Amino acid sequence: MTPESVMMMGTEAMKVALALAAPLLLVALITGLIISILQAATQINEMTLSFIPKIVAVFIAIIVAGPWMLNLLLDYVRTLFSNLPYIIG
Amino acid sequence: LDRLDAALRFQQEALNLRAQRQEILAANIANADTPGYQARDIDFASELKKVMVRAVDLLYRVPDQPSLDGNTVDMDRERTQFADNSLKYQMGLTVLGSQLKGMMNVLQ
Amino acid sequence: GQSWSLSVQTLVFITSLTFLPAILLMMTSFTRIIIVFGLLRNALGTPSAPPNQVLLGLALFLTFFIMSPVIDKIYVDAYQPFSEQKISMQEALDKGAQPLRAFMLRQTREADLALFARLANSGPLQGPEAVPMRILLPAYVTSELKTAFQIGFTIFIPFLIIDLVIASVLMALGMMMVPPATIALPFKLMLFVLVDGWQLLMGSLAQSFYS
Amino acid sequence: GQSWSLSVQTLVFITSLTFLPAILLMMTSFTRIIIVFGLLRNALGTPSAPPNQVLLGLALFLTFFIMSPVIDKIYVDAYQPFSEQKISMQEALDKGAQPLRAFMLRQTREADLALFARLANSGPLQGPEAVPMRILLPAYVTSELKTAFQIGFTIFIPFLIIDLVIASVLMALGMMMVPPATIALPFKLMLFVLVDGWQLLMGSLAQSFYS
Amino acid sequence: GQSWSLSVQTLVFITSLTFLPAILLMMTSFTRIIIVFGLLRNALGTPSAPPNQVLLGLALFLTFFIMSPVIDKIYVDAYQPFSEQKISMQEALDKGAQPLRAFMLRQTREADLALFARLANSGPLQGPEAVPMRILLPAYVTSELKTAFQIGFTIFIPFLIIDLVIASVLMALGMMMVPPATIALPFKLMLFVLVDGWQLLMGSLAQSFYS
Amino acid sequence: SFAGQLHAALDRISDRQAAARVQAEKFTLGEPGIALNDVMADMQKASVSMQMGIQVRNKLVAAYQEVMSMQV
Amino acid sequence: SFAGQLHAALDRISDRQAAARVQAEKFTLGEPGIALNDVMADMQKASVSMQMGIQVRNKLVAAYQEVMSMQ
Amino acid sequence: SFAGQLHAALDRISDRQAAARVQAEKFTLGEPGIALNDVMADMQKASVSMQMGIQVRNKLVAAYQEVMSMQV
């Protein structure tokens, strides 16, 4: 077993997480910053007041992502099974 | 044939030939007094070899001493033949029995 | 000519009937298959979700199918000359074992074979084919064990990715202190059933066997 | 056609009973039911609270009830001509097993039989009835696994919804360190007992399995 | 209605003894109690703290006592007539299960028998007592699960309320970190053992089961 | 019906064994018309039926134990 | 296949037993041509064949159960 | 090696049995030279060899099963 193939697969495997999570986490960052802006200029706050719109924000993000969020998961796993006869080496 | 019958065909044929030969010997014992009778016998070795290739022909026995009535069945020679034939039949029987017992004992 | 009598032949056959299903099947074709099945069972995040009897039956059917060409070869080369007593067991056994020996030789690792030969202190071989089965078997077992885990890690990868992404997205919004394992299981099962992991994986492993 | 002797008849009759716990139950009858029950117990958040003995007994009763048509058909078409010895058991076995294959064909995936046939490298078999029994069983088992996983995910989804809603509201209330597992579980149990999930779940599973 | 030989009578007697852990205990007597004990341990907030070796042993004491009138009725009307040999061996089994069947109806839900009767295609017919055993047993299990959860979530709510209220004062007092489980656990058990809910628990099981 | 078939088989074997025992009892006090070979054959058939019954019972209970002693 | 081979072996054993039984029947009916020295041999052959069959069945079923009870 | 020793032992057992069988066949064929005091002795010795072989087989398979069934 070639040690290079172990890490090279990991590089693309990890990028799948960045391909999937970034649409959700970046909007979470964007939503949170807007909340933080509301936490200034008459900055009244109880503890955070940030969780309420994030759930709505992620609710929209999941629906908007939808298929192409699923497509990456379906395609990458099938490639692993497709290459199984040739990963043995 | 089969692997099982291949081993025991020879002994079975020997037993059958022994039975037929004993039957012929008993027949010419029972016809000891009928005049004009000719003693019959089987060439055991040749018949066994012929059978172990694939009815049985009869060979007249040469008269010992002449008699007026035409009967040609001796008594002493045929009695010795009957005794030795029975003995070899029992020998074949016990040989086949030993083979079968060994085969059965292997499978225990 | 020389051969074995019926009694000793049937004794040898009955004795070999003991080893044949246990070890001649356990350490020859489907040990890596059952290893992969167990690894998938562990990866699914659930102990014994597919029952052990069902897994063993599927593995047995799969290995029967896989070994079909070799089965036909050994049949037509040994049984037919032997079922009509045209050959004796002494060399019939070697002729039957030759194709399986070739299959084991093909599915072996050269490093393992060399190490085992050096350990056995026998290096006069002129070609790979002339190796004895005594030195061939352990190397074959080791190579099969290696490739089993090599496939198993690839099986592991997607569920690990799903767990990592779901945990990250769950705890990014302030839900750090709640186990996402109970939530990842439905998504992993949905992904597996949607991609049809079983049928795809069976074909993948069959192609791996065909190299 | 001739008939087997009584000795070999009783020999095969006794021998089949050893395969009976696997061949008739595990890969034919209630693998879907047992997998669904296990996944439901996992989703409830407390495995081993429904004891395995009780779960297996319920599964046995459910599969016995759901196999009523095929059981009756095989019973008549085998016992009735075999009770008074009018046909040989060797042909009665196949004649009674044919409707079982017919039942298997409906429940199995039509797209996996072709894959298994190609794996077995069998010749082009025209017609959907002449499929050999050696190919139908593994494909049927794989289809059973697929549909069991699908049903498990579908059952999982509402519990995931409940857990997410409860966790979100409890964390928005003004407390975040409260373990939602011990809190949502009583609510899930109360919802389940209000909806009477056992009766309707069994009915829906039976309907899906029978059609 | 004749008797049997001695050899057959002991053959079925020992075989009937094999079913004792399954056919008579886990689906007739205490399948509800074990679930209550398991859920109570979960509700207590101390998982795996009470050993399951004693909890199972504790359960069998209670169910035997609560089943005393049934078994004593069997003893009077079956054992004594059998010692007189004025009742058939098969007759005693039929006449012993029948009063139990009425007992099962008492602890069965109102709208669960109809499910299996339609499922088994036996038809409605007439006579609540004239019911086959095939329908009684799975329905009894399903009904027992329903009442087990119904009596289950009754006890979960009081413990959950205590956990919620103790967390509320933390935010008011400035304890906002804040570990809810460690502080609340001693208070949960102190109220549990000061009121001695076990005697209330054991008493509740006795009256609720008999109804 | 499994229970009905089981009851039928059990009563049949019990009745045949009882009939064989009755035949042996009838012969043991010198009743006429009873053959020793017949009574021995009946005894052997009853014994072999009992052996078949106990064998199938053991196999069935072992199978039931195996199927009910698995992990779900 | 294995199923076909087992079916053929069972058919062969049943055929041998049936031939032995019918030969014994012909002998006991009084039909000429049987010498009692072959019926016994054929019965013993059938018995040893059946013994080999049951031994093979025991070995195979033991192997199957021990390989199914694995983990 | 073990395989070589097993092959040698089985081959010598088979050779002994074949020699005994061919001597018995020569005797029953009528060819002079066999006195019935050798065929029986050789058959008995062959049976002894077969008994030793089957006992060794039983012991070996028992030991193999015992060492293979250990819970590791």
With vertex at residue C100, the alpha carbon angle to CA C95 and CA C102, rounded to the nearest 5 degrees, is: 95
3-state secondary structure of B60: strand
d(CA H20, CA C193): 68
Residue in the structure block whose two tokens are 């009915």: D203
CA A74 – CA A82 distance, rounded (Å): 12
Nearest-angstrom CA–CA distance, D103 and D200:
24
Helix (H) or strand (E) holding B41: strand B40-41
Query: At residue C161, what is the residue type?
Result: I
CA distances from D26 to D23, D105, F70 (A): 6, 17, 11
State which amino acid sits at residue G45.
Answer: K
**What gap in Å lies between CA B12 and CA G42, rounded to an integer?**
10
Which residues contact residue H68 at a Cβ distance below 8 angstroms, ignoring those fewer than 6 apart?
A: C22
Selection from B65, B64, B55, B58 nearest residue B40 by Cα: B58
**Angle, alpha carbons H32-H36-H38 (nearest 5°):** 100
Rg (CA), chain B: 18
What does the CA dihedral D125, D128, D133, D138 come to, rounded to 10 degrees? 100
- Chain position carrying tokens 């022909």: B57
How far E183 CA sits from the closest chain D CA (Å)? 12
With b for 16 or more beta-carbon neighbours within 10 A and e for fewer, the A22-40 pattern comes to eebbebbeebbeebeeeee
The answer to whether D172 contacts A52, with C-beta atoms less than 8 Å apart, is yes
Residues C90 and C5 sit within 8 Å (Cβ to Cβ):
no
Degrees, nearest 5: CA angle D76-D79-D82: 130
CA distance F24 to D198: 58
Length of chain G: 71
- Can you tell me the distance from the alpha carbon of E95 to that of A3, in angstroms, rounded to the nearest whole number? 75
CB count, 10 Å around CB of E194?
A: 8
Residue G31 burial (CB count, 10 A): 10
Work out the burial of residue D206: count CB atoms within 10 Å of its CB; fewer than 13 is exposed, 13-18 middle, 19 or more buried: middle
DSSP SS3 for D77: helix
- Report the helix count and the strand count for chain E, using DSSP H and E: 10, 0
Spell out the residues 6+ positions from residue E86 whose beta carbon is closer than 8 angstroms to its own: none
How far CA E19 is from CA of E89, E146, G21, H46, in Å, comes to: 18, 25, 43, 53
The region that residue E175 occupies, defined by phi over 0 for left and psi between -120 and 50 for alpha, beta otherwise, is beta
Cα separation, A27 vs A31, in Å, equals 6
Alpha helices in chain C (DSSP H): 6-26, 31-43, 52-66, 68-74, 80-83, 89-106, 110-120, 133-171, 181-195, 197-209
Binding-face residues of C in 21-40 toward G, CB within 8 A: 21-22, 25-26
Decide if E15 contacts F61 (C-beta within 8 A): yes
Residue length, chain B?
A: 108
Q: How far apart are CA D164 and CA D181, in angstroms?
A: 11
- Tokens 């021990």 belong to G66
Query: Which structure tokens are listed for D121?
Result: 């490298």
CB atoms B107 and G51 under 8 Å: yes
CB atoms inside a 10 Å sphere around CB C128 = 12
- The three-point CA angle D121-D126-D131 to 5° equals 60
Smallest Cα–Cα separation from E7: which of F42, F64, F48, D17?
Answer: F48
- Report the residue from A28, A48, A84 with minimal CB separation from C204: A84
Distance, CA of D46 to chain centre: 23
Give the count of beta carbons closer than 10 Å to the beta carbon of residue C112.
17
Interface contact D54-E141, CB threshold 8 A: yes
Cα-to-chain-centroid distance, residue E67: 11
Quote the Cα angle for C132-C136-C141, to 5°.
Answer: 160
- Which residues numbered 11-30 in B keep a CB inside 8 Å of some CB on G? 12, 15-16, 19-20
Cβ-Cβ contacts under 8 Å, F48 against chain E: none
CA distance D97 to E178: 65
CA distance F46 to F39: 11
Distance CA C140, CA E154 (A): 61
Chain centre distance of CA A50: 20
Question: With contact defined as beta carbons under 8 Å apart, do G45 and G20 qualify?
Answer: yes
Is residue B71 within 8 Å of residue B37, measured between CB atoms? yes
Distances (CA, A) of B3 to B18, C124, D119, D142, H18: 24, 41, 37, 43, 16
List beta partners, residue B60.
B40
Beta strand B40-41 pairing with B59-60 = antiparallel
Please, what sign has the CA dihedral across residues G8, G10, G15, G16? positive
d(C-alpha A7, C-alpha G57), whole Å? 52
SS (H, E, C) C3-45: CCCHHHHHHHHHHHHHHHHHHHHHCCCCHHHHHHHHHHHHHCC
- DSSP label at E50? S
Nearest to D9 by CA among G48, G10, E130: G10
Q: How many CB atoms lie within 10 A of CB B92?
A: 21
Chain C residues with CB-CB distance to B106 below 8 A: 7, 10-11, 14
**Residue matched to tokens 């007189």:** E84
d(CA D57, CA D30): 11
- Give the chains touching G; criterion: ≥3 Cβ pairs < 8 Å: B, C, D
Mutate to test the interface with F, among E4, E18, E23 (most CBs of F within 10 A): E4
Cross-chain CB nearest to E153 (options D182, D186, D199): D186
Closest CA relative to residue H49, chosen from B106, B97, B7: B106
Residue with tokens 């489980």: E181
The radius of gyration of chain C's CA atoms, rounded to the nearest angstrom, is: 23
Chain-chain contact of H10 with C2 (C-beta, under 8 angstroms): no
10 Å CB burial of residue G36 (0-12, 13-18, 19+) is exposed
Dihedral Cα C88, C89, C90, C96, nearest 10 deg: 110
CA angle H10, H12, H13 (to 5 degrees): 65
Using an 8 Å CB-CB cutoff, list chain E residues near F21. 5
Q: Cβ of B106 and C11 within 8 Å?
A: yes
Q: Which amino acid is at A46?
A: E
CB E33 within 8 A of CB E62: yes
Q: Do H36 and B14 touch (CB under 8 A)?
A: no
Question: What angle, 0 to 180 degrees and rounded to 10, lies between the N-to-C axes of helices E89-106 and E133-172?
Answer: 40
Question: DSSP class of residue D38?
Answer: H
* Nearest by Cα to E198 from E44, E30, E29, E25: E44
Contact D165, D187 (CB under 8 A): no
Answer for the pair C207, A85: CB distance below 8 angstroms, yes or no: yes
Long-range contacts made by residues H18-25, C-beta under 8 angstroms, separation at least 24? H18/C5, H20/H45, H20/H46, H21/C5, H24/B95, H25/B10
Residue E101 makes CB contacts below 8 A (sequence gap 6+) with E129, E131, E133, E136
Query: Tokens at residue H57, please?
Result: 């087989």
| Residue D43 to residue D41: CA distance in whole angstroms | 5
For A54, nearest residue in chain D (alpha carbons): D168
The helix (H) or strand (E) run that includes residue B40 is strand B40-41
> Nearest-CA neighbor of B13 among H34, G25, H25?
H25
CA distance G59 to chain B (A): 12
The amino acid that residue E124 corresponds to is: P
Kindly identify which residue of chain B lies nearest to residue H40, measuring between CA atoms.
B95
Q: Which helix (H) or strand (E) holds E198?
A: helix E197-210
- Partner-chain contact H50 B98, CB within 8 Å: no
Chains D and F touch (3+ CB pairs under 8 A): yes
* End-to-end CA gap in chain D: 38
**Ordered DSSP codes for H10-48:** HHHHHHHHHHHHHHHHHHHTT-SS--STTHHHHHHHHHH
CB-CB neighbors (< 8 A) of H68 in chain C: 22
Q: Check CB contact under 8 Å for B104 and G48.
A: yes
Gap between the Cα atoms of C133 and C104, Å rounded: 9
Per this entry, what is the length of chain A?
A: 89
In chain H, what residues touch B91 (CB-CB under 8 Å)? 28, 36
For E83-122, b where at least 16 C-beta lie within 10 A, e where not — what string? eeeebbebebeeebeeebeebbbebbbeebbebbbebeee
Q: Are D5 and D14 in contact (CB under 8 A)?
A: no
Residue with tokens 């750090």: C176
Instruction: State how far residue C209 is from chain A, nearest Cα, in angstroms.
Output: 7
D53/F71 Cα distance (integer angstroms):
9
As beta bridge partners, residue B41 has: B59
| A and H adjacent (3 or more CB pairs under 8 angstroms) | no
Residue-level length of chain E: 211
Query: What span, in angstroms and rounded, lies between the C-alpha atoms of D209 and E190?
Result: 50
Return the amino acid letter for D210.
Answer: Y
CB C49 within 8 A of CB D35: yes
Q: Which residues pair with B40 in a beta bridge?
A: B60
Nearest CA in chain B to C86: B3
CA-derived radius of gyration, chain F: 18
Cβ neighbours of residue E20 under 8 Å, at least 6 residues apart? Answer: none
What is the dihedral angle through the alpha carbons of E55, E56, E61, E63, rounded to the nearest 10 degrees?
110
Distance between CA atoms of F15 and F12, rounded to whole angstroms? Answer: 5
Q: Is C80 on the interface with G (CB under 8 A)?
A: no
Nearest CA among F69, C131, A84 for reference residue E18: F69
Q: State the amino acid at position D199 in one-letter form.
A: Q
Reference D93, options D16, D18, D29; nearest CA is: D16
State how far Cα C137 lies from the chain centre. Answer: 13
Nearest to C79, CA basis, from C65, C90, C92: C92
| Residue owning tokens 């019918």 | G22
Burial (CB count within 10 angstroms: exposed 0-12, middle 13-18, buried 19+), residue B69: exposed
Contact present, C and B (at least 3 Cβ pairs less than 8 Å): yes
Under 8 Å CB-to-CB from D205, ≥6 apart: which residues?
D32, D33, D36, D62, D151
The span from the CA of E125 to the CA of H44, in Å, is 78
Q: How far apart are CA B55 and CA B23, in angstroms?
A: 15
Q: Which of residues 103-142 of E touch D (CB under 8 A)?
A: 111-112, 115-116, 119-121, 137-138, 141-142
